[PDB]
Amino acid sequence: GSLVCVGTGLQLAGQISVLSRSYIEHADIVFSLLPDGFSQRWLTKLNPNVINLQQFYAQNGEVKNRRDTYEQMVNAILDAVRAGKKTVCALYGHPGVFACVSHMAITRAKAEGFSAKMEPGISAEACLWADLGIDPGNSGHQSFEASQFMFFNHVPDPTTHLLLWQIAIAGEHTLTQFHTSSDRLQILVEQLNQWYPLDHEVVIYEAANLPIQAPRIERLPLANLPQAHLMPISTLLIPPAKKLEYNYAILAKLGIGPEDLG
């Protein structure tokens, strides 16, 4: 038995790697976690032996820590590996980006002496740069999970493009609910106001999952975030609040000035 975790990208069918597709095609069994039913059918036609990881999510409005869900996902994947199946895990986007199931399964597989690897995929971040025509290198880039940003001390650089992932559950500690509240989001705005004016334009981004679908690129002032219509797939982009300024300290050590910059 062996394990290969692949990503299918965000868009249907077209955004998976050539090699990653081949892995799915030749797998004994596939464990899937896909955005929609169109993506699900696509997968099943590629390889009919599919087990849908969605099933491990709470079904009947029951309270269940998503950490328990992930554990059952991991154990289900490892069971196939232990049995001797050439197992492939197919997650949407990039399998190791804001996704613990794969990292956990790989760690566990390796420790039990199984071959396990992760193939990189196209993430929501990757889609964002393209859809918004932004290069993360222009003035740099920072990414944080929205809740972690609230629970712990992160200091953002306001010259960079800042991303807050999983903004829809910002401040939702129990990890049972499928969304947060407007008051939680208001607290986030106040926190952000340390570095960003209330009228700072932010962007609610959602990459399209279908080829006939346009992405969501919704601009609004930060102060209006708490009233916004957020979905699980929403990512919040916070563009720079300040332009790049010269670092005279280091330039001096380099023995140059701004005018010497190529």
Binding site: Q11, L12, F38, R41, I212
Partner: protein, 51 residues
Amino acid sequence: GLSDFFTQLGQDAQLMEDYKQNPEAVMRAHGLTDEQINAVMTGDMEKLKTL
């Protein structure tokens, strides 16, 4: 009918470019209904996942 079309469109750059030239024509030619087409043109994904 709908699912097969979308899978092709997402994978095939020729068809993609055809579609972007004339969405309605390409969709109609692949047998999509008026309601399905309306759904696409209004950007109602939810209704697509029903149809």
